[PDB]
Design a binder for this molecule. Structure first.
Ligand SMILES: Cc1cc2nc3c(=O)[nH]c(=O)nc-3n(C[C@H](O)[C@H](O)[C@H](O)COP(=O)(O)OP(=O)(O)OC[C@H]3O[C@@H](n4cnc5c(N)ncnc54)[C@H](O)[C@@H]3O)c2cc1C
Ligand SMILES: O=C(O)c1nc2ccc(C(F)(F)F)cc2nc1NCc1ccc(Cl)cc1
Ligand SMILES: C[C@H](CO)OC[C@@H](C)OC[C@@H](C)O
Length: 450
């Protein structure tokens, strides 16, 4: 148990603040720190911190306490018959994935990096490539133990007597208390592999058409990279990757011996093999166009996790960036296209772009995902950006969509509240379970959730 004044930022490395960071594997010691903050009521409160993968300010508390949860990382049990895992909130999804595979169990929702805690996964109600078929992380929690402001540990379930507080904690960014422990229902699987279909579109219109032609219902997993820099018609052209978990008999004979094995992250990546880039005299001409179309079009390709899910891993080596993520309701297709147009003409160039059609939402009043067009872009920080993303906020807002707290460090409270029309409902729950504001964060203060 060590308390240390530490300078903390999100993954985006901005808006730093200084907090007292408690790092203890001792659960009783955590209960006491919270009991202390509640006693000298009130101060600048406390907030949990997972692995720090949120880009913004949700896991920090300037001039307050921050409880690092990563030492509470015991997997208590895994059961293949019930498909249930019982794990501390500090367990991470990579650790969990590894521990569970031998049981034929699969982490039901995986984000774009496995370095996130169970606590972070719940508090941000994270989504992945399978949202349209599996919903978000919150949908899969069968119980969790929440340390509240009064110093008690409350056992919450999605349909029990504490359902309301359960669903306020899902997506609650740690502002209902500290998730100590949870039970997750896993997805059964017979292999660690995917059967994947790849498609390449020529334009924004094609990308939308492919996601609206009914084909999505044939794949449990689906996401795309899209072009956000090229002028129309090239704007919004996409490499789409869709699939489902493979069964044993679908594997080639070579891989049937160990169907649930995970492959090691290799020493040599593509920057190590080709140091001078991948560009040749063909890349930007018709043969290049033809080559990209071909490599990105395929059917029934067997892929492991890295290949199917982390296709940025092969580009290795390739701070001053602003991550922006929003979703626009399904029906607002024209408005969605408009927003992509605004991005392209902005003079702000993003290369790392995610496109995904979200499925049905859950009952959490602060849950980010709603059915519709989800987009992430990554803008280099340069003159004009701050004021331009505010304009984007305005358009996202008026088009019925919202920003994601896990990605935000700079939107206003007014915008956020308008984007989340159930925020008042949520605030009423939070105020009932934390009258003295024992739990607090830089985000809570910025977005007036405190
Ligand atoms: C490369 C990359 C790819 C990503 N891809 C995706 C994606 O595909 N989908 C997606 O949804 N997100 C994605 N994210 C965002 C990420 O999944 C979330 O920010 C997640 O919350 C990070 O978990 P963490 O353990 O690092 O939590 P932190 O960022 O440390 O904390 C996040 C929030 O969770 C709260 N919290 C953490 N632990 C606890 C606890 N034990 N009890 C109560 N509250 C707690 C904190 O108070 C804070 O509000 C991505 C992030 C990166 C960097
Ligand atoms: O960096 C992030 O914050 C991120 N956010 C994501 C949000 C949603 C999705 C989803 F839509 F696929 F679920 C994937 C994400 N991948 C992410 N990162 C991995 C990645 C993989 C490929 C690309 Cl073209 C760009 C990013
Ligand atoms: C962005 C989305 C999430 O992982 O999938 C990207 C795939 C479809 O494209 C591969 C990239 C590297 O070109």
């Amino acid at each position: 148990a060590t308390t240390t004044a530490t300078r903390l930022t999100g993954w985006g490395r901005t808006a730093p603040s200084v907090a007292n960071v408690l790092r203890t594997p001792d659960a009783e010691m955590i209960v006491k720190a919270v009991a202390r903050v509640a006693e000298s009521g009130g101060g600048r409160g406390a907030i949990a911190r997972g692995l720090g993968r949120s880009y913004g300010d949700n896991a920090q508390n300037g001039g307050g306490l921050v409880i690092d949860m990563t030492p509470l990382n015991t997997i208590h049990s895994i059961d293949a018959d019930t498909k249930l895992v019982d794990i501390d909130a500090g367990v991470n999804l990579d650790q969990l994935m590894k521990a569970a595979l031998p049981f034929g169990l699969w982490v039901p929702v995986l984000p774009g990096t496995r370095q996130v805690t169970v606590g972070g996964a719940i508090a941000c109600d994270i989504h992945g490539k399978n949202h349209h078929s599996a919903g978000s992380f919150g949908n899969h929690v069968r119980s969790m133990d929440l340390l509240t402001a009064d110093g008690e540990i409350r056992h919450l379930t999605p349909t029990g007597e504490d359902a309301e507080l359960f669903w306020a904690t899902v997506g609650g960014n740690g502002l209902t208390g500290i998730i100590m422990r949870a039970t997750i229902e896993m997805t059964p699987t017979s292999t660690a592999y995917f059967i994947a279909d790849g498609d390449v579109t020529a334009s924004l219109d094609e990308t939308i058409a492919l996601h609206s032609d009914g084909s999505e219902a044939r794949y449990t997993y689906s996401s795309a990279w899209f072009d956000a820099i090229s002028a129309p018609p090239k704007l919004g052209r996409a490499a789409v990757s869709r699939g489902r978990l493979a069964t044993v008999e679908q594997l080639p004979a070579k891989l049937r011996s160990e169907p649930l094995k995970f492959d090691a992250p290799q020493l040599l990546t593509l920057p190590d093999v080709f140091p001078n880039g991948l560009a040749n005299k063909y890349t930007f001409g018709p043969i290049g166009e033809l080559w990209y179309r071909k490599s990105g079009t395929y059917r029934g390709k067997v892929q492991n996790l890295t290949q199917f899910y982390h296709p940025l891993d092969m580009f290795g080596e390739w701070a001053g960036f602003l991550q922006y993520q929003f979703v626009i309701p399904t029906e607002a297709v024209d408005e969605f296209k408009k927003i992509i147009g605004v991005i392209q003409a902005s003079g702000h160039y993003s290369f790392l772009n995610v496109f995904k059609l979200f499925g049905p939402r859950n009952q959490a009043p602060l849950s980010f995902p709603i059915p519709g067009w989800n987009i992430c872009v990554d803008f280099p920080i340069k003159d004009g950006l701050g004021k331009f993303v505010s304009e984007l906020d305005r358009r996202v807002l008026e088009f019925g969509g919202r920003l994601y707290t896990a990605k935000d460090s700079r939107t206003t409270a007014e915008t956020f509240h308008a984007m989340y029309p159930r925020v008042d409902e949520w605030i009423s729950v939070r105020r009932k379970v934390d009258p003295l504001r024992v739990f607090a964060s830089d985000m809570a203060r910025r977005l007036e959730l405190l």
